């Protein structure tokens, strides 16, 4: 249980392995 | 080495509105994935978590202030800023900035290392 | 949300003794619990991680232990300087987190 609605958006720089991450990451520079 | 820096005003009017700024050096904050996060403790009293924020503009922040806080963060002078607003008696503490640690692959949630902290009172 | 208590509220302790502070939590929270330590005027340092690792810099008499509910932080052989205030943290679900309301170490008499 993560709760990435917490952010305003997730860096995908930090997203590390986690496949959830992924789907709603954002990439940046 | 990495050091962490507060400053601020000494004191502040209520309704009026609160700048802080935390300066890091020996450091870069683009220097790896952490997190930067204020913190306060009113004296006599617990810790408070006010807000995170990364070098992307990625912050959370608690909920019980995000519609005074304000949190950014300038990669070119390595600083990290908030601000309240509409200040009150119940905001007078020690503000503090901390580097986080926010990792996914082994769940990792800490503050190290923090900074002196600077006291804000409060008063008419 | 999950809930950090802690136990108990001053701990009086002579030096050289052994300090046994608790701290539970209301639900499960696995291995993902820090202690801190504030000595007064100071502010926190990071004692323990993921409830029993040791941070780089920290003496060796401070030492972590539980999992789950219950956790425990033992001061072996405790020196002047470790009369503080100790706080837990509890951060099961990423990026969430909760602080323990802190025991305090005092001398003994």
């Known amino acids: 249980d993560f709760h990435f609605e917490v952010f305003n958006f997730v860096p995908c720089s930090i997203c590390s392995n986690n496949p959830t991450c992924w789907a709603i990451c954002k990439r940046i520079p | 080495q990495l050091q962490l820096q507060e400053s601020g005003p000494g004191l502040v009017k209520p309704s009026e509105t609160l700048s802080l700024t935390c300066t890091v050096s020996?450091?870069?904050?683009?220097?790896?994935?952490?997190?930067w996060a204020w913190i306060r403790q009113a004296p006599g009293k617990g810790l408070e978590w006010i807000g995170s924020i990364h070098y992307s503009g990625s912050t959370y922040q608690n909920p019980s202030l995000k519609s005074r806080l304000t949190i950014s963060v300038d990669t070119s002078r390595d600083q990290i800023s908030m601000k309240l607003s509409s200040v009150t008696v119940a905001e007078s503490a020690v503000y503090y900035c901390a580097k986080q640690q926010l990792s996914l692959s082994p769940v990792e949630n800490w503050f190290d290392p923090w900074g002196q902290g600077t006291l804000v009172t409060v008063s008419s | 949300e999950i809930v950090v208590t802690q136990s108990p509220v001053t701990l009086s302790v002579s030096p050289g003794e052994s300090a046994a502070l608790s701290c539970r939590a209301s639900?499960?929270?696995?291995?993902?619990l820090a202690w801190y330590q504030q000595k007064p005027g100071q502010p926190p340092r990071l004692l323990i991680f993921?409830?029993?690792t040791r941070e780089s810099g920290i003496p060796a008499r401070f030492s972590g232990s539980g999992s789950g509910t219950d956790f425990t932080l033992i001061i072996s052989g405790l020196q002047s300087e470790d009369y503080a205030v100790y706080y837990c943290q509890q951060y099961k679900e990423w990026p969430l987190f909760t602080f323990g309301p802190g025991t305090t170490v005092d001398s003994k008499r």
């Open positions: 020996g450091d870069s904050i683009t220097s790896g994935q952490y997190y």
């Open positions: 639900r499960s929270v696995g291995s993902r």
């Open positions: 993921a409830a029993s």
